[PDB]
Amino acid sequence: ITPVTLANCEDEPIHVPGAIQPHGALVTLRADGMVLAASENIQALLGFVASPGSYLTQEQVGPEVLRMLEEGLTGNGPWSNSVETRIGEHLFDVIGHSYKEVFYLEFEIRTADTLSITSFTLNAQRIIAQVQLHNDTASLLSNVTDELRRMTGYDRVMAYRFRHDDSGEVVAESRREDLESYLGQRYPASDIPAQARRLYIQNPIRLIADVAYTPMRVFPALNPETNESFDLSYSVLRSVSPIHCEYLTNMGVRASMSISIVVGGKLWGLFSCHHMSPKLIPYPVRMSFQIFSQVCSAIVERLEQGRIAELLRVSTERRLALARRARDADDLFGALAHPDDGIAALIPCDGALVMLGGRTLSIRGDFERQAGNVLQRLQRDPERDIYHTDNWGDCCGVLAIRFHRQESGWIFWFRHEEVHRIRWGGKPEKLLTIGPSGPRLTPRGSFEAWEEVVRGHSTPWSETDLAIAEKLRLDLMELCLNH
Numbered sequence: 228i229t230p231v232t233l234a235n236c237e238d239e240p241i242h243v244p245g246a247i248q249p250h251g252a253l254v255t256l257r258a259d260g261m262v263l264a265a266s267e268n269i270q271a272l273l274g275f276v277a278s279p280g281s282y283l284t285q286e287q288v289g290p291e292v293l294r295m296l297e298e299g300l301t302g303n304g305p306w307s308n309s310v311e312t313r314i315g316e317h318l319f320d321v322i323g324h325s326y327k328e329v330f331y332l333e334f335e336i337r338t339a340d341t342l343s344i345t346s347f348t349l350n351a352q353r354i355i356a357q358v359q360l361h362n363d364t365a366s367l368l369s370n371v372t373d374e375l376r377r378m379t380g381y382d383r384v385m386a387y388r389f390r391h392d393d394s395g396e397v398v399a400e401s402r403r404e405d406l407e408s409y410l411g412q413r414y415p416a417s418d419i420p421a422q423a424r425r426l427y428i429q430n431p432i433r434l435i436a437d438v439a440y441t442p443m444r445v446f447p448a449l450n451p452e453t454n455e456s457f458d459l460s461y462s463v464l465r466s467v468s469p470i471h472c473e474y475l476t477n478m479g480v481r482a483s484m485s486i487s488i489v490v491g492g493k494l495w496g497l498f499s500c501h502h503m504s505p506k507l508i509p510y511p512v513r514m515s516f517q518i519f520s521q522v523c524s525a526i527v528e529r530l531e532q533g534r535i536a537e538l539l540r541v542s543t544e545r546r547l548a549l550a551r552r553a554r555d556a557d558d559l560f561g562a563l564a565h566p567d568d569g570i571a572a573l574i575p576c577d578g579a580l581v582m583l584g585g586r587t588l589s590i591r592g593d594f595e596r597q598a599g600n601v602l603q604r605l606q607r608d609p610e611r612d613i614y615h616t617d618n619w620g621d622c623c624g625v626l627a628i629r630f631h632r633q634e635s636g637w638i639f640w641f642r643h644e645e646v647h648r649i650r651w652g653g654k655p656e657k658l659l660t661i662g663p664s665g666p667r668l669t670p671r672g673s674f675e676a677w678e679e680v681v682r683g684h685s686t687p688w689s690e691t692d693l694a695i696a697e698k699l700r701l702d703l704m705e706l707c708l709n710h
């Protein structure tokens with residue numbers, strides 16, 4: 228019965244809302260096919276009253292439907308299927324699935340004049356051609372963002388990237404003129420709490436037909452079998468958190484639809500479609516996006532590792548240049564401090580320090596004091612050959628490696644505090660009408676929430692950045708020992 232406030236919202240059970248969106252009806256069955264619960268609108272949408280204890284009957288739901296249901300009813304492992312069928316006055320999409328051991332049948336009115344197979348195929352071809360045309364991982368995102376809008380007619384579609392700390396960044400955008408831009412927006416991990424994030428990962432597509440909707444409750448609330456709520460995780464019609472709904476209306480959005488990009492076990496980022504009036508996307512089309520989601524995820528994965536590959540390649544090429552020079556010139560300092568192949572170019576940094584013997588070369592600033600303090604901190608830890616941190620002198624980020632012990636051969640890279648890369652301003656943008664929860668649920672409030680998180684922090688060191696440092700360290704050890 229608990230109200231969901233700003234304090235609660237992190238722990239909101241959004242998977243068991245026990246209600247569904249109004250653009251469809253829902254019937255929940257148990258293993259034997261016996262009805263356990265239904266949305267309060269089954270009668271109003273489909274001509275009949277589903278009742279707990281009942282079993283579904285032909286042409287109160289039609290034949291092919293039970294035909295489908297029986298198949299999944301007798302199959303081990305998460306059944307999933309859909310049928311198209313006429314029930315009374317209308318034809319329906321009857322998407323059905325089984326999660327836990329409860330079976331779900333979802334009913335959407337089908338208004339499309341097209342054959343489903345071809346509608347599905349047509350859109351799949353169109354939206355994944357965008358995945359064959361681009362080598363830049365950012366062109367991919369940018370282009371499919373522009374294309375998703377062309378296909379769906381959404382007012383605004385955005386591509387989010389998710390950082391290491393699960394903070395988001397709007398990296399692409401295609402929007403109707405009128406609308407303010409959110410390009411370069413940054414929001415915290417708390418804007419998409421655990422359960423919501425778990426769900427985007429498990430579900431390629433989420434659709435919100437109308438944010439201003441009144442939910443259609445499924446009765447009864449609790450599954451008699453367990454005396455605990457129905458887990459609508461894989462339910463297409465599952466209802467929305469009032470918090471998110473308030474957020475979206477603060478923005479002035481009325482319909483959403485998001486396509487996930489999952490790589491590893493991580494939500495790599497999603498495409499969020501927003502409409503200013505309510506909007507619906509037919510089932511077969513959503514399936515076009517679902518399959519797309521899986522392929523795009525695959526290509527983004529490769530494109531990303533193709534990116535790291537090239538980073539490693541030019542790094543070694545520079546380690547080669549470095550090895551070449553060092554042996555022939557015989558001062559390392561000159562080699563390391565080289566303007567372009569220098570260490571400052573090896574790994575993205577705002578500065579670097581080279582330190583062998585008693586001599587100190589600070590390149591791109593005065594870093595001698597910091598390096599001294601960092602080194603003192605490592606006093607307590609004589610065995611550390613590598614040190615790094617984004618919390619901390621005057622530079623937040625530090626990556627230090629040791630290549631000579633006795634003569635204190637050290638290398639440092641430094642990073643300043645992370646800064647909002649792109650920022651809007653210039654003319655006060657319009658007044659958002661703000662709900663009861665407060666300004667926290669506006670983009671402006673989200674950004675501020677993000678600042679408070681990152682400030683005091685430099686950008687984390689790449690998986691890649693550390694790998695390079697490690698290779699460099701090996702190089703110099705070799706050199707110093709060798710000659």
Ligand SMILES: */C=C/C1=C(C)C(=O)N/C1=C\C1=NC(=C\c2[nH]c(/C=C3\NC(=O)C(C=C)=C3C)c(C)c2CCC(=O)O)/C(CCC(=O)O)=C1C
Nearest residue numbers: 236237409414417418419420423467468471483499670673
């Ligand atoms: C304390 C919990 C929450 C806060 C605070 C909050 O702002 N939202 C909270 C819960 C959920 N958010 C969900 C989706 C969601 N929220 C955001 C934040 C933004 N979305 C935007 O579009 C913009 C700016 C344009 C911001 C700053 C995002 C990006 C998302 C993902 C979907 C989307 O992008 O539209 C969410 C999931 C709700 C659901 O679909 O069930 C919850 C529970």
